[PDB]
C-alpha cells in the first residue's frame, strides 16, 4: 500500500533509502577487512539516530 511511506521521513525517505542501501551493500559486499571500520567512533559511541 502506497500508505507505507513515513510522512515525517517522506521528505528524507529517499536519502534514507539510499544511505541504507549503501550501508547494506558495504556490509553485504564481501569487503576485505576495510580499515574504514575504524576502531574509533563506535556506533555505540555514535549518538544514536534517536
Amino acid at each position: 500500500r502506497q500508505h507505507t511511506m513515513v510522512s515525517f521521513l517522506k521528505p528524507v525517505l529517499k536519502q534514507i533509502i539510499m544511505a541504507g542501501k549503501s550501508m547494506q551493500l558495504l556490509k553485504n559486499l564481501q569487503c576485505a577487512e576495510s580499515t574504514t571500520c575504524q576502531a574509533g567512533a563506535r556506533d555505540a559511541e555514535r549518538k544514536s539516530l534517536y
Binding site: 571500520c37 576502531a39 563506535r42 555505540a44
Partner: protein, 96 residues
C-alpha cells in the same frame, strides 16, 4: 599448550603480553557495554601475533619447506628421475 607440553619451556608467542591482553579484557569487563568490535580487534591482534610467531617457528624452526620438499620428491614423485630409476629397478618385484 600441547606443543609446550612436549616442547621445552618455550614461552608463549605473546609471552608477557598475555597479561597485557588480560588487562585489556579486564578493561572490557569494566566497559559498561559489550563491544564486539573492540573484543574482535584484541582477538585479531593476539591471533596475528601468534600466527606470525607460529609461521616463523614452522618455517625456520620446524623447516616446513624441507618436509614439503621431501613429500614432493617422494609422494609427488618430485625426484622424477630417482623414482623413474626406482621403478625401472623394482619393476620385477612390483609387477607381481
Amino acid at each position: 599448550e600441547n606443543q609446550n607440553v612436549n616442547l621445552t619451556r618455550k614461552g608463549s608467542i605473546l609471552k608477557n603480553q598475555e597479561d597485557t591482553f588480560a588487562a585489556e579484557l579486564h578493561r572490557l569487563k569494566q566497559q559498561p557495554l559489550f563491544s564486539l568490535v573492540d573484543f574482535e580487534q584484541v582477538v585479531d591482534r593476539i591471533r596475528s601475533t601468534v600466527a606470525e610467531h607460529l609461521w616463523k617457528l614452522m618455517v625456520e624452526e620446524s623447516d616446513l619447506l624441507g618436509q614439503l620438499k621431501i613429500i614432493k620428491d617422494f609422494y609427488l614423485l618430485g625426484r622424477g628421475e630417482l623414482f623413474q630409476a626406482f621403478i625401472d629397478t623394482a619393476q620385477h618385484m612390483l609387477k607381481t
